[PDB]
């Protein structure tokens, strides 16, 4: 199951200074970037165009240009008309895309100063529980605009799913790649035993500290950390007693090994 994600990052320091940057993710892989500086969206992958034609894409490319500039002037209008409820600096984040089933569900979420305030749903924008009361009139206005409502609707209902199914076909060679993890052991006075695992793709990996048949229930699994080359890094730990570290092992299971589990003895 894959989640397509267009993330938009917009900053407003004052009147005059503003910048909108954006990145597009299919699952855990980047497909697009769009800096404030660039006129066109850039492809990060060779397949980021999916199965859209050149015209298909160029028309879509324009619509976002017309959006990015409009999104800025509008937000800065919304602050000029506001006050003193709102003032600079202002941060806006926007997350939109669609999840994939064997069937889909699209989404649009807006967050203002870090807190999630607005989502688009069905045929209309709506404020989300706890969001600032002053957003109501603004959202009402935004919904009396049919053209915008309609473009957002068409992008969410029609394009996102179509666009995504193309990428899933196009990037098959990159999404189904298999990368083997190399692993090493270290220790550090808390004594603590760290099991490093690096370079694996895709993301699901099984790492555990062992004493024979027995998985040590005391294993602390870290957070997945990104490598520079689109592989993953992970660590596992286990606090040990004085003599207890002699006889322990680190076992690593991954899809890239295929039965060939990595077992490191301390």
């Amino acid at each position, epitope marked *: 199951n894959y989640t397509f994600r267009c993330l938009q990052m917009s900053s407003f320091a004052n009147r005059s200074w503003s910048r909108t940057d954006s990145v597009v993710w299919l699952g855990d892989l980047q497909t697009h970037r769009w800096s404030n500086d660039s006129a066109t969206i850039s492809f990060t992958k060779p397949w980021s165009q999916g199965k859209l034609s050149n015209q*298909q894409w160029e*028309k*879509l490319q*324009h*619509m976002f240009q*017309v959006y990015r500039v409009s999104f800025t002037r509008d937000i800065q209008e919304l602050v000029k008309m506001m006050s003193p409820k709102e003032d600079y600096p202002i941060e806006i984040q926007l997350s939109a895309g669609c999840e994939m089933y064997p069937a889909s569900e699209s989404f649009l979420h807006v967050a203002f100063q870090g807190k999630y305030v607005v989502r688009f749903w069905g*045929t209309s924008w709506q404020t989300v529980p706890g969001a600032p009361s002053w957003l109501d009139l603004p959202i009402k206005v935004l919904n009396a605009d*049919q*053209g*915008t409502s*309609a*473009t957002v*609707q*068409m992008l969410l209902n*029609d*394009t996102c799913p*179509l666009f995504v199914r193309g990428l899933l076909e196009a990037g098959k060679s990159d999404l189904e790649k298999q990368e083997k993890p190399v692993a090493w052991l270290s220790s550090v006075p808390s004594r603590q035993l760290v099991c490093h695992v690096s370079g694996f793709y895709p993301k699901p990996v099984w790492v555990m500290w062992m004493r024979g048949d027995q998985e040590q229930q005391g294993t602390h699994r870290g957070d997945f950390l990104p490598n520079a080359d689109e592989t993953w890094y992970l660590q596992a730990t286990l606090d040990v007693e004085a003599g207890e570290e002699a006889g322990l092992a680190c076992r690593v299971k991954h899809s890239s090994l295929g039965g060939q589990d990595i077992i490191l003895y301390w």
Partner: T-cell receptor, first 111, second 113 residues
Framework: KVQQSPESLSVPEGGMASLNCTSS?????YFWWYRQHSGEGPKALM?????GDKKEGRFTAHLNKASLHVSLHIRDSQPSDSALYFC?????????????FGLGTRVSVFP | KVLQIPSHQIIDMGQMVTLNCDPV?????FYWYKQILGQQMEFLVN????????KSKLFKDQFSVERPDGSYFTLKIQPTALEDSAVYFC????????????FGPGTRLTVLE
């Protein structure tokens, strides 16, 4: 091609003019109604693209994407309603488009 | 309001005609529409930012649509069949699709022998 009905309708002041429109391509289930008076620029009356009804004041419109069939209902017909009503289908997934109208319907409201 | 001027123009065959259009500010999607004897509305061209996009079959080989910065949006018939005598409408959109197109009052062209 988008086929309209009829060639011409004739409604009495107060009655309701009802028109039809059908798309033949499954990728054109997003419709517009544009009204134009004599020697004058067309104005957009209303959009649909959604399976329901849509009441825009004195105007109601029903769409069924299922059979690509639309209807426009001009209830409480004004004298100032007598005009050429056009209907066009827009393409699914385009984002840069010409409104491509059918043959249009001349409505004559009379007192 | 999308403005067209003028409005009622009579031209003799063989000499080029300029049809000026002054679209609504903030819009960047332009259109030309032809209606002869007042019957059928016909799409010709759509323009965006700096270049044309969809040119229809009705867009003759003798036609040209420019939009320099500061000036109007101009269709130029050059030149100039007796079949051109019709009404042409300019239009603005803001959104590329799925949103209202605004039509001008049109220019009545009359090419004559």
């Amino acid at each position: 091609k988008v086929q309209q009905s009829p060639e011409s309708l004739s409604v009495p002041e107060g009655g309701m003019a009802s028109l039809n429109c059908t798309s033949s391509d499954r990728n054109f289930q997003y419709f517009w109604w544009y009204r134009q008076h004599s020697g004058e620029g067309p104005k957009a009356l209303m959009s649909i693209f959604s399976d329901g009804d849509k009441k825009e004041g004195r105007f109601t419109a029903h769409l069924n994407k299922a059979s690509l069939h639309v209807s426009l209902h001009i209830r409480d017909s004004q004298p100032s309603d007598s005009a050429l009503y056009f209907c066009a289908a827009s393409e699914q997934n385009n984002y840069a488009q010409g409104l491509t109208f059918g043959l249009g319907t001349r409505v004559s409201v009379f007192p | 309001k999308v403005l067209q001027i003028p409005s009622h123009q009579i031209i003799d065959m063989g000499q080029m005609v300029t049809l000026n259009c002054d679209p609504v500010s903030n819009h960047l999607y332009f259109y030309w529409y032809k209606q002869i004897l007042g019957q059928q509305m016909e799409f010709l061209v759509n323009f965006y930012n700096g270049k044309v996009m969809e040119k229809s079959k009705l867009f003759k080989d003798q036609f040209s649509v420019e939009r320099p910065d500061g000036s109007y949006f101009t269709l130029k018939i050059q030149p100039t069949a007796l079949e051109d005598s019709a009404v042409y409408f300019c239009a603005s959109s803001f959104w590329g699709a799925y949103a209202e197109q605004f039509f001008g009052p049109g220019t009545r062209l009359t090419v004559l022998e």
